[PDB]
């Protein structure tokens, strides 16, 4: 096995409104080992009312954070994914980003930038700037690996007037893993 799943069509497991106590958005995140790197797949689907009424605004920054431990499981008390990451065919430290090439500490060799697109309901296409930040920080003492995701959007015209569902284009990226 070399695939850290989340689910091909998972239920609600991620919170976006910071302060809720029931999960309200689905997050699809697939990591695969490939030689000396890890390839990634990540998308986010809003499955509530407030997240679906996010893109009536013109400047929106969506943050999703993940805090693994030394073994490599999500601590759901302090993370932002409220469901553990499971394998496919069966210790899961092999999919986590390296603390040799992205050390803890300025020091902007940690970030990985990129883009996705939001397909609006009136046929419009808007670009979302994705910032994937690696380790960079320690929120706790028991936290051993950090991986955060950010979807930034600034637009002149407003993207949506009525509420539609929130759906982003998939994102693909690669990072150096811990052995």
């Amino acid at each position: 096995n070399n695939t850290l799943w989340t689910g091909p069509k998972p239920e609600a497991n991620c919170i976006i409104e910071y302060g809720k106590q029931n999960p309200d958005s689905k997050l699809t995140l697939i990591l695969v080992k490939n030689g000396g790197i890890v390839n990634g797949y990540v998308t986010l689907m809003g499955a509530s009312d407030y997240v679906n009424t996010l893109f009536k605004n013109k400047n929106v920054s969506i943050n999703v954070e993940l805090y693994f431990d030394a073994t490599g499981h999500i601590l759901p008390d302090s993370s932002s994914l409220k469901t553990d990451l499971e394998l496919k065919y069966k210790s899961a430290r092999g999919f986590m980003p390296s603390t040799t090439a992205y050390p803890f500490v300025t020091h902007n060799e940690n970030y990985i930038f990129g883009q996705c697109y939001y397909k609006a309901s009136d046929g419009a296409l808007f670009p979302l700037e994705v910032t994937v930040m690696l380790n960079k920080r320690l929120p706790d003492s028991r936290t051993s690996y950090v991986m955060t995701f950010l979807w930034s959007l600034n637009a002149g015209l407003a993207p949506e007037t009525t509420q539609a569902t929130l759906i982003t284009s998939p994102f693909t990226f690669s990072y150096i893993r811990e052995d």
């Binding site: 976006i16 409104e17 910071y18 302060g19 407030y50 996010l54 605004n57 013109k58 400047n59 929106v60 920054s61 969506i62 943050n63 600034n154």
Partner: protein, 187 residues
């Protein structure tokens, strides 16, 4: 059920990232925002145990609203948060002068930030044509005007317009500097 003060104040940066500390109200107390005066976006999230107002996943804009007055109950009071403007909104220029130390032209511009501050003042540089040394600049701050004055008595040139301070981290790496031409006549 009892507060400590009556009128709270605070300051949050314009176009800041999510989950930043705005202010820390005080009065187990479950802090409860009940109304905003601009009410349609929830821009502020109140941590219920400690009274720390945070900026949630939707971000602000000073040019739509500069003062948020929200009423909060601690189980009444006011909260009056002001927005500090950062330098987005590149200036735009709405330009002929004839000579015979006589001032030549008057250049009127239009920014969009807080009026009076150092993110509003148009600072005027030189692009192509003052190698003869003919024009010295002056930024009339009280009405934001680009006065020029003669240097060497006796041709056209161009001006690149920017703000007084440096731009924000978002509008930079998009600003393409476009030169703007001034035609000077001589008798």
């Amino acid at each position: 059920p009892v507060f400590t003060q009556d009128v709270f104040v605070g300051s949050v940066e314009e176009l800041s990232a999510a989950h930043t500390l705005v202010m820390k109200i005080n009065a187990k107390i479950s802090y409860r925002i009940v109304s905003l005066e601009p009410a349609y976006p929830p821009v502020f999230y109140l941590n219920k145990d400690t009274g720390e107002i945070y900026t949630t996943s939707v971000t602000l804009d000073r040019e739509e609203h500069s003062s948020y007055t929200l009423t909060v109950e601690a189980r009444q009071a006011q909260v009056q948060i002001r927005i500090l403007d950062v330098n987005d909104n590149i200036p735009v220029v709405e330009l002929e002068g004839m000579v015979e130390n006589v001032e030549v032209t008057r250049i009127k511009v239009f920014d969009a930030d807080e009026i009076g501050s150092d993110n509003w003042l148009a600072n005027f540089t030189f692009a192509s044509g003052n190698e003869g040394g003919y024009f010295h600049i002056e930024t009339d701050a009280q009405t934001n005007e680009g006065i020029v004055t003669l240097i060497k008595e006796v041709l056209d040139f161009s001006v690149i317009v920017a703000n007084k301070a440096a731009f924000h981290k978002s509008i930079r790496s998009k600003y393409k500097p476009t030169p703007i031409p001034i035609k000077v006549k001589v008798k």
